[PDB]
Amino acid sequence: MKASRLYTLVLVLQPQRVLLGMKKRAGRWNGFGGKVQEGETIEDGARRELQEESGLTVDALHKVGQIVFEFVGEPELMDVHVFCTDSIQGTPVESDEMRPCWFQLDQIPFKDMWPDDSYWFPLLLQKKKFHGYFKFQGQDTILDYTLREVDTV
Ligand code: NA
Ligand code: NA
Numbered sequence: 001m002k003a004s005r006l007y008t009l010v011l012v013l014q015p016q017r018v019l020l021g022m023k024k025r026a027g028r029w030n031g032f033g034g035k036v037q038e039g040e041t042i043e044d045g046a047r048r049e050l051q052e053e054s055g056l057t058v059d060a061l062h063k064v065g066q067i068v069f070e071f072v073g074e075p076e077l078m079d080v081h082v083f084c085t086d087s088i089q090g091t092p093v094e095s096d097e098m099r100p101c102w103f104q105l106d107q108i109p110f111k112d113m114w115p116d117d118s119y120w121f122p123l124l125l126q127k128k129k130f131h132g133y134f135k136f137q138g139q140d141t142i143l144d145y146t147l148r149e150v151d152t153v
Contacts, residue, residue, distance in 0.1 A: 004068065004077035006036035008046035010061060011084040011124060012054075016105055020113075021054060021098040029113050032056075032098075033080070046083045054100050055093035058085045063153050064124055067116065067132040072143070084124065115140065119147050129153045 011031045012019035020029040032053045036045035046061050061083035069078040092100035103109055105125065110118050116134045123130045128149050135144040 002070070002075060002077045004079040006042065006045075007078050007080045008033040008036060008042060008049055009067075009080050009082045010046050010050045011064075011082070012050075012056065012086075012088060013084045013124070014086055017102045018105060018108065019054070019056075019092060019100055019102055020109070021092075021100045022112075024095075024097050024099055027112070029101075029103075029109050030117075031082075036081075042081045043083065046081065053095070053098055055090060057089045058087065061085050063129075065120060065130040065132065066153055067120065067130075067134065069116075070133070070135040072135070072137045082120075082124070115142055116145070119145070123147075123149060 009031045010033055021032055022029050032050045033046060034049040034053065036042055040048065043061055047058060051057055062085060063081065064084050065082035067080045067082060069080065094100060108121065116132065120130050120132050130147060131150050132147045133145060134142055137143055
């Protein structure tokens with residue numbers, strides 16, 4: 001089994017809308033996140049990346065899933081810990097690398113999101129926790145995947 005590198009992903013999910021960020025430098029909408037750093041808990045890394053990438057703070061996040069990504073031709077797995085919050089402080093801020101935008105929950109831009117999101121995002125919306133794994137060839141093609149609803153992430 002490959003080694004894995006820890007990443008976070010944060011979905012700001014309100015009753016009627018979700019906040020996503022368009023990768024500028026690319027072209028897909030995503031939640032906010034990045035690599036976990038030495039000496040921080042995963043949840044604190046998720047809060048830090050949300051702030052660094054969107055400007056938003058939150059004192060707390062809820063863990064809702066975990067997704068492992070494997071890319072053909074790459075040595076490591078990405079181990080992505082997925083969090084959500086409904087409660088925000090501040091306005092999101094655009095950067096040179098990310099543009100934040102709200103989407104109504106009947107206009108989730110799945111066609112402009114990574115392909116895996118079509119599978120697990122619906123579970124998140126139903127308040128269901130999940131474990132996933134996706135193997136990609138490049139950015140467009142899934143060769144294998146697993147997904148399961150879990151009671152405990
Ligand atoms: Na990032
Ligand atoms: Na994704």
